[PDB]
Design a binder for this molecule. Structure first.
Ligand SMILES: Cc1sc2c(c1C)C(c1ccc(Cl)cc1)=N[C@@H](CC(=O)NCCOCCOCCNC(=O)C[C@@H]1N=C(c3ccc(Cl)cc3)c3c(sc(C)c3C)-n3c(C)nnc31)c1nnc(C)n1-2
Length: 124
C-alpha cells in the first residue's frame, strides 16, 4: 500500500469558499451517510483486498476519506478542485472493475446522488 493522498500542503495557502463549505456540509455528508459509502470512506487497501495491480493501474487514487480531510484542512483551492476528486474517485472504481460488479452499481448510485446535490450549489 502506498502512502495516502496528501491532506495538507504548507506551501498551498489555506482557502475556504461558499461552495467548498457547501461541499463539506451538504454534499459530502449526504454520501458519507449513504449505505453505499463504506468502500469509499478510506483509500483502497490493496493489501487487505489482494489487489496487486490497483496502484499500478490506478495512477490517481482518491477516496472520500481523503476528500473529507482536505475540506476540513482547507486544502482545496476552490470547489472545482473538490468536485474533480469526487469524479476521480468514481472513475477509478468504474475503470478498475468490471461491468455488473456490485461496486459499480453502488458507485453509480453515489454518483447520481453527487450530481443531484451539486445542482444545488451557489457560485464561486
Ligand atoms: C492460492 C492462489 S490460487 C490463485 C492465486 C493464489 C495466490 C493468484 C496468484 C497471484 C499472483 C501470483 Cl505471483 C501467484 C498466484 N491469483 C488468483 C487470482 C488473482 O490474481 N487475485 C488477485 C487479483 O484480484 C483482482 C480481482 O479482484 C476482484 C475484487 N475486486 C475488488 O476487490 C475491487 C474492490 N471492490 C470492492 C467491493 C466489492 C464488492 C462490494 Cl458489494 C463492494 C465493494 C471494494 C473496494 S474498497 C473496499 C473496502 C471494497 C470491499 N473497491 C473500490 C472502492 N474499488 N474497487 C474495489 C488466482 N487465479 N487463479 C489461481 C490458481 N489463482
Amino acid at each position: 500500500n502506498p502512502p495516502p493522498p496528501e491532506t495538507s500542503n504548507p506551501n498551498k495557502p489555506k482557502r475556504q469558499t461558499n461552495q467548498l463549505q457547501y461541499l463539506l456540509r451538504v454534499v459530502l455528508k449526504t454520501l458519507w451517510k449513504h449505505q453505499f459509502a463504506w468502500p469509499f470512506q478510506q483509500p483502497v487497501d490493496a493489501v487487505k483486498l489482494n489487489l496487486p495491480d490497483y496502484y499500478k493501474i490506478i495512477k490517481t487514487p482518491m477516496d472520500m476519506g481523503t476528500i473529507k480531510k482536505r475540506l476540513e484542512n482547507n486544502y482545496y483551492w476552490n470547489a472545482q478542485e473538490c468536485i474533480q476528486d469526487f469524479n476521480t474517485m468514481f472513475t477509478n472504481c468504474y475503470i478498475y472493475n468490471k461491468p455488473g460488479d456490485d461496486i459499480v452499481l453502488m458507485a453509480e448510485a453515489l454518483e447520481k446522488l453527487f450530481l443531484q446535490k451539486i445542482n444545488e450549489l451557489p457560485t464561486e
